[PDB]
A paper describes a structure:
Three Sso10a homologues are encoded on the S. solfataricus genome: Sso10a1, Sso10a2 and Sso10a3 (29–39% sequence identity and 55–62% sequence similarity). The structure of Sso10a1 reveals that it dimerises in solution via the formation of an anti-parallel coiled-coil structure.
A notable difference in the amino acid sequence of the three Sso10a proteins is that Sso10a2 contains four extra residues within the winged loop domain, not present in Sso10a1 and Sso10a3. Sso10a1 and Sso10a2 structures also differ in the orientation angle between the α3-helices. As the relative position and orientation of the two α3-helices is predicted to have an important influence on the DNA-binding mode, this could result in distinctly different DNA-binding properties for Sso10a1 and Sso10a2. Such interactions could underlie the observed DNA stiffening and the salt sensitivity of this process (see Discussion & Conclusions). The increase of RMS at high concentrations of Sso10a2 suggests that, besides bending and/or bridging, Sso10a2 has a second binding mode which leads to the formation of stiff protein-DNA filaments.
Residue numbers in the entry:
A (entry chain A), B (entry chain A): 7 to 104
Write the structure that this text describes.
Amino acid sequence: KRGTMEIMFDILRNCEPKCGITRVIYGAGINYVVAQKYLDQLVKVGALNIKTENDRKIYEITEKGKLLRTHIEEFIKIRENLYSAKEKVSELLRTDSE
Amino acid sequence: KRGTMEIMFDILRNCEPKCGITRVIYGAGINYVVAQKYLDQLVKVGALNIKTENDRKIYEITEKGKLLRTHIEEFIKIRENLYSAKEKVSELLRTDSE
């Protein structure tokens, strides 16, 4: 179960330099309805530019989009480290005396 | 607003080598009712030993307790890094075009 940040990451990392909807749906593992919503959001915040070529929508990652991809990646990796650190605390919160 | 892990950290870092209730209440910034609950938990999971000396309860951090303190500290620090990383993503999710 992915949140918004992570879906965006999964889109963006499949849109370098360009992506159509096939690449987005299959690369990010999201359906057409979800893809449409997020793509539109990413165009709005300037992470992707949109073109039509051969009657197909083509998205291109922007410099700002590359930075967004990098920052989400960094968030995800730290979040993983946080889960591990929490598990290490939890291991110490057991007892067999009681 | 602190969760359980963090309160425990705030107790433990004030119980080296020993702490009475004054040191726990004032050092961890928690009331007597909260302190009683957490102290009891920390004794149960083997992070503190409890003695009575001069009719006062004295708690001593154990080797396991020192490790618990260290691991919570590490959790807290990573959690802070996660907040910052999230803020950096958020900064990129704005637009003034719409």
